[PDB]
Amino acid sequence: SPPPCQGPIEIKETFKYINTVVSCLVFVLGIIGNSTLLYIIYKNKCMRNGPNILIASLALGDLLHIVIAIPINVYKLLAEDWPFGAEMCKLVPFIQKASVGITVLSLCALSIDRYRAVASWSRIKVPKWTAVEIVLIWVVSVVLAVPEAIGFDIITMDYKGSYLRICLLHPVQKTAFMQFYATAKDWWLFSFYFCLPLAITAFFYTLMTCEMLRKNIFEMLRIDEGLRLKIYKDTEGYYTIGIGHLLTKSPSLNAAKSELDKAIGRNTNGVITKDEAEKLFNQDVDAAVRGILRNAKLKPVYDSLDAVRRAALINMVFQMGETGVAGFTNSLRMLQQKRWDEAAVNLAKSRWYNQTPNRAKRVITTFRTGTWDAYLNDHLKQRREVAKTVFCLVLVFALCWLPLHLARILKLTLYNQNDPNRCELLSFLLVLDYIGINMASLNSCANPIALYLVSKRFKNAFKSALCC
């Protein structure tokens, strides 16, 4: 019923050579990297307890994935006919997808653990239940990768004059569930093993970054302004509370209690909590941000800046009126053009600097360096570093595993049995699959190295680890 091809199924020898080189390099480098990670974790008995066990599980998944995926695909590219038997035809995809699941789940859980270790307002602590979590990860991985070991089989055929022994997921199946699995395996993999953890870790990372922004601006304004839980009359002669939250310009302390209760949602009697002050400060921050974007003098400057410099500008808009910050047309010009040091020297000459030198110096340092170094302590900074490293790792994953999934999706979406010259697309997909294997093994190889990349602790570990 389907006509044959005038064009053959072929792979150019140039791609064969270059891809074998790439695959061999990836294999050796990944073996070495994951083995060294495991060795330094094994010799590190003091840090054996902690989140290091998730690194151990991730490296184990990486090493297993490399060991199973690289040589068999090298052989499939070279010998183009395999003698290992239906035992291996069922065994290989099983362990392969099990290792894929181990890697995915362990990396996602590491990123979630890093979101947990940085945040506040948490539980008691991580200590013990994460090992049961490792058992769950490996068990769910092995269970999910079972339809692979059930549906694969070896078939033979006489093709254009040759007796071929093909190992594949059988296009016809005994179970009705296995038929649906053969139909939608690529969709299942693309959703669960790629889209799901990518989106979950992206949600967690966005949550973490917003939480960090709020807590850091709270720390900054606490240091610069001051935290008072009881009503007081500020310098300009008006009642306020919290972190400089004006209640009313009218001289009635009772009419100020009225507005305070109207804001907090309870009978306060002029006294609030540290966390209620934090919620009110978040409300004030959001109100300032919304007002700034309605000021044509301040809106493009705000839209130009990053998060930390936005927070410094919000600090300034807290201290002085919105029009007061609008009165800095020169320094705002320099900040919008990202001329940091010149804006610093121009702000250090203002009246605002001379009246409030401490706050001015810290805000100007924030503008120049673009960091929270003036306010926060080093524990928070190391936590941020580690979290951002793990997130960059999930990004490396999401970009390395995309081509293989996309090649499978293209095979599912564009193949038409009736086309005579479809074998062009077939050879194309062959090259794409042999490239996607390399990309996946490259991610699972660079996990330890890319962890070394943007983390000082793992840079030190990579420096020290040598022979044994």
Added chain:
Amino acid sequence: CSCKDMTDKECLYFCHQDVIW
């Protein structure tokens, strides 16, 4: 890989040459 049915020999030869995934 897989194919829709066994009637297509070209996709079978593909999965003979294809990677194992």
